[PDB]
């Protein structure tokens, strides 16, 4: 079917490269390390989503004046003024930022939050991108053994 649709559009022939994985057994030793647990990986991603949602509600309830990703000045947008928007911002930027979320928000120099927000970012870093990606990688390393 995909080979037939490739005539209507000469780009569905890219889906035929999936045959090197779902077809011949030359890649089983590599893909088996990922397909072995599977359930553990989706459960890990779900737990990560839950933890990021927890951090999102905490930030929405206690950190308003920090998410101010304005460009060129006086353009406050992409803030935490919406729960879904803040959750998407977290799950899309803070996870992939490589240094937690404390590097993509304003500087935590304000009173009443100087230490609370520092604890916030450092716990996000240590719980999301340190011990929740180490789990994802350990699930791949243990499958080989």
């Amino acid at each position: 079917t995909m080979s037939v649709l490739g005539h209507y559009n000469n780009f569905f022939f890219a889906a035929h490269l999936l045959d090197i994985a779902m077809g011949f057994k030359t890649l089983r030793t590599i893909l088996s390390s990922v397909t072995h647990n599977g359930k553990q990986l989706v459960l890990t991603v779900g737990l990560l989503a839950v933890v990021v949602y927890l951090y999102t509600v905490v930030a929405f309830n206690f950190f308003r004046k920090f998410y101010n990703k304005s460009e060129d000045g006086d353009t406050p947008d992409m803030k935490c003024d919406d729960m879904l928007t803040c959750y998407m911002f977290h799950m899309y930027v803070g996870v992939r930022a490589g240094g937690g979320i404390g590097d993509e928000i304003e500087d935590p120099a304000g009173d009443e939050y100087e230490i609370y927000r520092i604890i916030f970012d450092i716990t996000f870093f240590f719980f999301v991108i340190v011990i929740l990606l180490a789990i994802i990688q350990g699930l791949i390393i243990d499958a080989f053994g």
């Binding site: 009173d111 009443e112 100087e114 230490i115």
Partner: peptide, 20 residues
């Protein structure tokens, strides 16, 4: 005002050990 006083309040509890 809690960025500086937190460590002082944490260390103020060990005076009961310093007296002993």
């Amino acid at each position: 005002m809690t960025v500086k006083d937190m460590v002082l309040a944490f260390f103020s509890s060990y005076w009961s050990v310093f007296v002993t």
